[PDB]
Amino acid sequence: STGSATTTPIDSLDDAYITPVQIGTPAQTLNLDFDTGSSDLWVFSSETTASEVDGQTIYTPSKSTTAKLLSGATWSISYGDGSSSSGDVYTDTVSVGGLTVTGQAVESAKKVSSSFTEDSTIDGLLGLAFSTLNTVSPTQQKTFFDNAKASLDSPVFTADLGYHAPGTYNFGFIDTTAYTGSITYTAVSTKQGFWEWTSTGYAVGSGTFKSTSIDGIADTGTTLLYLPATVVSAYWAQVSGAKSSSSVGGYVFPCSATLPSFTFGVGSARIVIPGDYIDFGPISTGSSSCFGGIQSSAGIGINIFGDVALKAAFVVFNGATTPTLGFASK
């Protein structure tokens, strides 16, 4: 089987991407944040604390004839950005772009932290990391991709995120018309539960390529590109007036700038992030200081190839017995 769904930026900055998901019978459609950096599918719901819902669409399990309470199961999750959610668990039918999984764990939020309440465009997350990270207890549950992969024509999904435009998540096949040249595949470690790989280096604008190994994760659920402080300093040093601000929480740069590109290595191949992709606009409305899309990972513990990097490529998440990642230019 295969599936194919359009994913759409939630705002003018591409801060996140939402993809419609059909849950239950009759279908209830929610717009979920597909996250290769986590492994829970959780939704705002009829059970969510009423003061913590502000415009999102809710899953009402009592209206689905195929929903079943997963007795005893609870979940609770905190993300790298400090945000968090928790609740109980139903199994139900879930479809994405025509691909249907029966018996999928749908984690119903009883509570969500303020950042989720404040984002009316995201009705939940659909996790696409490895199931070993799933938080459901006492019986850990599988991700949608895990549940579907035996039925898929090929055990893969692909992420083709747009720059200021919609893009596509495909399940079970590789659209050979979606990218240019060839796909370069690279090894994955699943030991931390993530799509972790090692980039072979980087270049800043027209500069010469620095060969150096950079371990990090392919995370569609993180907006920006987080890299070692040495790499990030070399990038922003090429932008007049750029500076790391502790008050703002990252590198900022004069909105009048033209940013250079940033190249990252995938084996012998190279993915170029255009400079415009690295501009996240004024730090506050009307400010002439703009927030940068490449930031230091020094405070995280892990480097993150988030949307800023992934939207420059066609990305293959290969879930064969030995997972790999593939990157093509597009």
Structural domains of the chain sorted by starting position, each given as residue range(s) with its CATH number in brackets? 5-174 (2.40.70.10), 175-330 (2.40.70.10)
Q: Provide the residue count of the chain.
A: 330
- Catalytic residue IDs: 35, 199
How far apart CA 224 and CA 141 sit, in angstroms, is 29
- The experimental method, as deposited, was X-ray
Cα–Cα distance, 122 to 55 (Å, whole number): 9
Query: What is the token pair recorded at 319?
Result: 């879930």
Q: Which of 118, 103, 126 is nearest to 43 (CA)?
A: 126
Q: Which two tokens stand for residue 99?
A: 């691909």
Q: Residue 299: phi, psi to the nearest 5?
A: -90, 0
Indicate left, alpha or beta for 139 from its phi (over 0: left) and psi (-120 to 50: alpha): beta
Burial label for 165, CB within 10 Å (0-12, 13-18, 19+), is: exposed
Rounded CA Rg of the chain? 20
Do residues 57 and 30 touch, judged by C-beta distance below 8 A? yes
* Buried-exposed string 258-273: b where 16+ CB fall within 10 A, e elsewhere: ebbbbbbbbeebbbeb
- As a whole number of angstroms, the distance between CA 16 and CA 7 comes to 10
CB 318 within 8 A of CB 190: no
Backbone angles phi, psi at 307, to 5 degrees: -55, -45
- Consecutive H or E run containing 116: helix 114-118
Q: Can you give the resolution of this entry in Å? A: 1.3
Q: Who's near 288: CB < 8 A, 6+ residues apart?
A: 254, 255, 256, 282
| 3-state DSSP assignment of residue 115 | helix
In the sheet that holds 210-218, the strands lie side by side as 269-273, 262-266, 196-204, 210-218, 303-305, 225-227, 294-296
User: Does a cis peptide bond (omega within 30 degrees of 0) precede residue 166?
Assistant: no
Q: Interior CA angle at 212 toward 210 and 216, to 5°?
A: 120
| 129 SS3 class | coil
Burial of 256 (0-12, 13-18, 19+ CB in 10 A): exposed
d(CA 66, CA 28): 12
